[PDB]
Amino acid sequence: EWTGDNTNAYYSDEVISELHVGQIDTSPYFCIKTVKANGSGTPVVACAVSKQSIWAPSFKELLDQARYFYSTGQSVRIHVQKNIWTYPLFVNTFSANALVGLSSCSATQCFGPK
Amino acid sequence: EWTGDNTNAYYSDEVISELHVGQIDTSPYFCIKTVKANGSGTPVVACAVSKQSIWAPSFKELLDQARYFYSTGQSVRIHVQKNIWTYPLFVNTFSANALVGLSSCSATQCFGPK
Amino acid sequence: EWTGDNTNAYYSDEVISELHVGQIDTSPYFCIKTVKANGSGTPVVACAVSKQSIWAPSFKELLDQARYFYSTGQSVRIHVQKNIWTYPLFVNTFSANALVGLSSCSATQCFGPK
Amino acid sequence: EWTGDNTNAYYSDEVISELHVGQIDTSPYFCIKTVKANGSGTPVVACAVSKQSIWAPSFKELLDQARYFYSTGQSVRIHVQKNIWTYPLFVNTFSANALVGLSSCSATQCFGPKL
Amino acid sequence: EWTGDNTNAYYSDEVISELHVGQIDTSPYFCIKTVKANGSGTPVVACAVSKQSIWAPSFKELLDQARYFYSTGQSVRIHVQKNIWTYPLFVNTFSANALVGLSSCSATQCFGPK
Prior knowledge:
Five copies of one chain form a homopentamer.
Chain A: E1 9-24, E2 27-36, E3 44-49, H1 59-72, E4 76-81, H2 88-93, E5 98-104
């Protein structure tokens, strides 16, 4: 598996606008919400769960990187894998998107798979 | 179990106004005090204990997140489970509230379970 | 044992004015010096030593918290247990106080055991 | 092995201009892009991958350091070992360069190995 | 062993002016260069190697502390043990000095062994 697999979706020129930290089924997790830097489009929500999914090994790094980009407010490309989380109240509150990557974005391109 | 379980309480648009770090029964712990952003109502106190309760696995993440929100002074939603801590002097100093989650808040809603 | 045990001493409205990191007898350690915010009184010196004393489990958290409070220079309450470190040159340079807790002192009285 | 081995390449007075974090084959990884502080030359891309390559033990330290140098925008010397990552789509997106060191730079030199 | 052993050398009223991170023989390491806060004298260069020397246990703490002092540019006392590192090209590039401690410095004294 790879962040850049074409079965993963991504959204460019986003800003991380919200951050949540909690626990579910003995596992710490976090979620983020991102919106287009230019105000257009629909927000993206994605979560990472510490002991769950194939993306579990990157939990800490993604959390640190999410925090980093959240704090700078810079434009980023967010990479997700859809339909991963299954607990209905959790999905309803957040989404079924697994966070699988974060790339910085300049004015022209983003530094990551496309 | 989940941060968003309806058996948990939450308080929106709070600002973390105090932070304490210590140890009890071989376990590091931290507590925070939060107050409504507009100054109304009564303060919320909640603690996380590294080797105690079902919320133990999230100790580090919660600590880190609390620190962050404490440093920015931003409005957040705090999620707690009541009546968890039992050492009477501890409870009297702080509270019996276990900290189980922290969410950023926009101007309208908070990014977390409700 | 608890940070708030009445056999521990504490000092309110202090500012962390110095920070030292080193190693002794296979253990990383840190020490802090605190002084009254208003300039009065005598400095307090306290140390935490990795894997040494009953307070060992909280080393990391205390180190991080000391660093945080050191960087903001905010008013704090420092909690110590006296007569713990015994290595004489170490005690002479710093003190025998084990650092066992740190509390913020912003709004009302300090946020910790009293 | 050593960051300063003469079989490694390095580029001085670079600024970390981009940062990416993701996962590949069970491993968290990060990549950076750097460009000359004075605007000359061509960008350098390098990646570090957790638990992969001989440079695996330094993953955490390098990630933290890259984040720091990225946030300040200061001039650095970047040390890489070429032709380490082999997964073709990954390489095409980024490069085959393993990141093996980062050094701060002054006006006259960088604080790290050179040939 | 102790940071403050009189067989270790130290240099007061220094500023950490450079930072390097790398790997040697499967070990992450870092080096720092320090100069007198007033610019006089000769730089001090010292390194820590995570799996080498009696000082290995303090690697992480020293790395964090070096980073901290480096980011503030504040005056410090640096403590080293001479003639520790032995790989000749490494010593040529940096030095044989092991970093064994860092102390903050006020205008008068430094907060550490002397």
